[PDB]
Design a protein around this nucleic acid. Sequence first.
RNA 1: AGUAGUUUGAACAGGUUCUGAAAAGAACCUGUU
Lengths: 443, 880
Amino acid sequence: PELEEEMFKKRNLTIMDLHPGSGKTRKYLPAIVREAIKRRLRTLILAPTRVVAAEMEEALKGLPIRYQTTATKSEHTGKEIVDLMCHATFTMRLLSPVRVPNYNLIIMDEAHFTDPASIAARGYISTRVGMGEAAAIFMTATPPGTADAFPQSNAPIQDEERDIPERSWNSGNDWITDFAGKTVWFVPSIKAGNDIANCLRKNGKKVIQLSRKTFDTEYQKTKLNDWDFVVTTDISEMGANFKADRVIDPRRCLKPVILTDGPERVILAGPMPVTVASAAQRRGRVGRNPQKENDQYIFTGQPLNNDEDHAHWTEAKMLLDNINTPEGIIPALFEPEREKSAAIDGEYRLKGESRKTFVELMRRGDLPVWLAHKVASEGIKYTDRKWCFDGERNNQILEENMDVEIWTKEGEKKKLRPRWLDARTYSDPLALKEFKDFAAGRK
Amino acid sequence: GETLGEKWKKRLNQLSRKEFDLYKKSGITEVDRTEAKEGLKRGEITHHAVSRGSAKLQWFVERNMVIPEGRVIDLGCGRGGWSYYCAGLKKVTEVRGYTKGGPGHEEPVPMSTYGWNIVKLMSGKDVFYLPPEKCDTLLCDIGESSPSPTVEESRTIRVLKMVEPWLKNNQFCIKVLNPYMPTVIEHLERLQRKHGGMLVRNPLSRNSTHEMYWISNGTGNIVSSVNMVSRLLLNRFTMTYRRPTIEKDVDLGAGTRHVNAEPETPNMDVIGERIRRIKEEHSSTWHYDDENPYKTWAYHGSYEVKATGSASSMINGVVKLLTKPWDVVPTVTQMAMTDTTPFGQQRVFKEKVDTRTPKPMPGTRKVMEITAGWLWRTLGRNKRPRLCTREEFTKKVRTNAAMGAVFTEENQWDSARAAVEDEEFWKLVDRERELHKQGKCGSCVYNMMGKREKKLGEFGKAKGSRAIWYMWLGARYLEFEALGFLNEDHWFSRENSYSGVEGEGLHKLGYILRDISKIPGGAMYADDTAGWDTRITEDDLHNEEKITQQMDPEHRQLANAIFKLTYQNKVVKVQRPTPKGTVMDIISRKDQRGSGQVGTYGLNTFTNMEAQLIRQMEGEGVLSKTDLENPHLLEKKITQWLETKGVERLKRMAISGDDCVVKPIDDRFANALLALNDMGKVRKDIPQWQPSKGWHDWQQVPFCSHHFHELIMKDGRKLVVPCRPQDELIGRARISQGAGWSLKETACLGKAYAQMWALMYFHRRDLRLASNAICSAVPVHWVPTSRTTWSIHAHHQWMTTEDMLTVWNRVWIEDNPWMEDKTPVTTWEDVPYLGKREDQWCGSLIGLTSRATWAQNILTAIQQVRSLIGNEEFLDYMPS
RNA sequence: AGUAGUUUGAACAGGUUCUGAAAAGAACCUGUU
Ligand SMILES: Nc1ncnc2c1ncn2[C@@H]1O[C@H](CSCC[C@H](N)C(=O)O)[C@@H](O)[C@H]1O
Ligand SMILES: Nc1ccn([C@@H]2O[C@H](COP(=O)(O)OP(=O)(O)O)[C@@H](O)[C@H]2O)c(=O)n1
Ligand SMILES: Nc1ccn([C@@H]2O[C@H](COP(=O)(O)OP(=O)(O)O)[C@@H](O)[C@H]2O)c(=O)n1
Ligand SMILES: [Mn+2]
Ligand SMILES: [Mn+2]
Ligand SMILES: [Mn+2]
Ligand SMILES: [Zn+2]
Ligand SMILES: [Zn+2]
């Protein structure tokens, strides 16, 4: 694992485009961190999700790293120059009024990740690199512009387009249970995963469920060898070392989409094919052992690279245009991300008080970026909740085919009718409960 | 290579008129100008912007990208939108615009918008030959588009070479007409490397231009921003047409502004000796600095010193671990200590102290003279001025009071106690007093520091709030001897002054307000002057001096010496950061209040009493606009009004420094701003000519940072209690002087905050719960000896709930004159609460899910803090 | 649907501790102008 010196000097941004299983997380990252410790560089490491952070912590044994992620433990002393956190944590700290260190070196794993905060962080990092104040390494196997859904692997992979079931199945589907090895099944939601894993445990196969709600207990259990199925959401589609044998990827998901169509709103557009990068990353979780040649990938459709109307480009621009630092940096998008029409076209910078309300709405109210920006750009204060009831009669929230009606904190009974509609505020029952709490003044 | 901007220009040059007219406004932001244009046609000269440039400049100003301040130079001012917008900003004291005019170019248009009196637009000037001047803000909006990119490049380079000499460590906003040509980019990168700033695209600009703006308050990569703008403009060609985002136009107000920047003229027959002594002291490093920033002060020299002050805060661990729901409240977590380093002191000086206020008109001066004479005669009806002695000063001075030594012969005492005990100190005092008796001063110099307090800020720092001035301990004794009778005889107490509240106490102020609410009249007004001590003219300094007419000849000599040599001729030492280090500047000023003098509170109260009396005069029709402009105004009418009803008008007011509560006989007082603004007492947080807001409930009137609620107890007794937003209290309790985190060595400070909450803010549910939790999480045998140290009294529990209840009964029942009944309260359950709606309105988090979780599981947090401290003796304060 | 987390002025008021037989003195803390 030889490292070019040029990646440690300022104004240099290094893209590392190795195929999955090449060793970016376990070979190159420890060497880069060791060389950065030797040269005394303030270093930041950015993991997309918590499973990637766990893999980093496993692969960084014996180095002084000040972990700032909930997934990992904490025994930092005070002499660490290396921090580890997530993309969203870094971006929300950049939007916050607390100063962040001037890192001399930034390593970002899975720099293709399309969370709005990840794109905003990429823009900020590339802007800092362009000013000659830092150097960056972006580690990703499926970079922007990827059309290969079947990248190179350590071992050959058998790709078969069967018909993966969505819910539990009374009978049939013998190909599923007849398998002898370990299988990683990707599901689009925790509820579908619950149903599938119940059906799988009904057949005498013990199953581990991975989600953001069950990660803390279940990931370490997955790090054993007992299990036979891992039913998981896309929290583990990047950087997860499962030592599995088969991957089952229906290649379907829900995406937030902004519709102008008169009054602008956000909808969770129905089950669509995942992008090529997501499919390639999901396939890359298997075939990582050069000693096992029988690894299988079972999919149920073709991916789409049509990633243009999705809300995360607009939300990334909204987050990037409101980054607040002592030096007053105005950042720009990462260059391969400037070819997106919705990202490049946004002028979303807010005036000071509106920016503070925007950050408060995202962090305290747990509103989506689009809705928080829409509310803040009207000059509405955080504690003012009248906009949740001032909407047109078409923006009525229904539950059980009945109007959602709430008791405000000032002792009034009102119909939930927000001025701006975000489908992520009333999609799941938990999201609806949280939004009802917010609209009632309890949040 | 062909840049993206050149491709965009080629594409733009080949649009038909229809598609060009659709493209130029596709998706841009745009202000509505129809009403403003109709008004401007009809000759209306108020509230209207003269062009679209006011909104464009406002976009940068509200994003803090440019902060106009001081003197503003507007090159290519055109009609004057930028200059007229900058006139209304509070930090701007003078606007000068230069436009070429003539045929084919816009000429300046006269307007009477807010601050118009400080605007001078000169036509017929070609800025390419105008010599550079010193300015605090420079706004350049020069450049005209041509279809040829090379012509635009040449014009842009010419503008960039013209504006460069004008820039020296100041604010700027400069239009770069054509920023995509490579030579313009290299020039801009060199200019940014030298001066700073950043290129920013304004969303109000049309799509038919590639113009960007070089701003001072920003950083970033110029090439990337230019590329982003080029891609934006190219993408705008093909996407579907969008109606531009209409936003409402800027309202520019109306009325003049009471600002002035005339330089200071030193006396040098009063202050020459002090400056000569100072120069002789630090002769080794004495120099004269031409980069000094002082505009309205006289500058005499500088010498190198080692910087003092700090800008750091320490986190209080016990309070922070027990107030978790407030970790997400910005008003709580953004509290910090004010910046008192030379940088922060210099910023405070530049904003507040380094300003000037215009002279009042002759009628205003005459009214002030009459009112001050009558008020001084009223205040001394039963009291005579008297000399204070060295015995009282020795009895009163704090042991750790700052010596404030300026000259070497004064720097041989470590504490004030040692100095007042010594016999050489009083010999220094005697020689300076002998100089004073001859009308000369030789050693009365003001040290200047910053106030170190808790304030809302960001990035761990808060803006400096004020400047504190103080002389050497001997000079402080001399001014105590001359003028200390005002404080020691209680001249501004409620009994003697009818409107002062000196010696009252915060918790007892609400009763006073309630007593004011029973006087018939209009609403209740409470206005604060913006930077009160910097608005003190020489006129009201003389009016304060007028007290010397009630003294005996020797006391009069001493008081005249203090008033004329030290209060009206002030020599100050102030720190300044320079690239070579830190220097101390010797500056001079004649008119202001030196907050830190012995007569600060009393003379502030006196001047505010007379200002509010004059405002009541104006509100009652005794003073009109013509009376205030009259060099020969009649004294009989003012004297008649005073002798007839001045005491009754004084009884309608509660005065503490510049805080005032006034309940006039009607509401014309709300609009009586002529005399008030002419005396220089410009109100804060409000346009200079907007009528003031009056409260009809005395329980909402803010006074001394608080308002007051009337609680009713179970036994039917009433109780007026102080209250403020809860975030302020919680945030102030969570930080302290120092740096870093602190848990064990600030637990007793947290307990003291809990005791203060239990005593003054017992009516707030969150505050009582948090105080009980903090007390339960602090070892019961520790007693503080400083802010960080403690002693262990193993035989005694410091303050139990019973001790706190006893203190509460003493303060609110036994020692309360306003409660006729005196039955003590036996349990904390009889101590009342605010109503739940009142509690919620004043910032409580009751009714929130995080607050409910915190209250339910509070014992877990108390035990966590207990284990963090260690194995100590703990007592439970939480009610059963 | 999914994912990530808050990182040494002047005037005054009140309280506390120690000394004192009480007065009174000594020290500290918080707050207001
Ligand atoms: N060489 C030059 N010297 C001085 N003024 C010039 C100039 N070249 C152009 N100008 C003036 O600069 C102006 C540019 S437009 C200024 C708009 C202004 N901000 C507002 O809000 O009204 C034009 O009116 C033109 O008259
Ligand atoms: N405990 C582990 C974890 C991973 N590995 C293997 O090490 C290879 C590279 O691991 P990696 O996490 O760095 O993969 P990439 O991040 O480069 O995609 C993979 O083939 C893993 O299967 C292992 O041998 N033992
Ligand atoms: N800590 C303080 C606060 C106020 N003051 C005096 O009280 C005046 C007004 O007080 P303030 O709190 O309203 O502040 P400003 O109005 O001056 O900005 C000040 O100008 C000072 O003269 C003081 O001497 N020490
Ligand atoms: Mn990896
Ligand atoms: Mn004030
Ligand atoms: Mn005030
Ligand atoms: Zn003197
Ligand atoms: Zn209140």
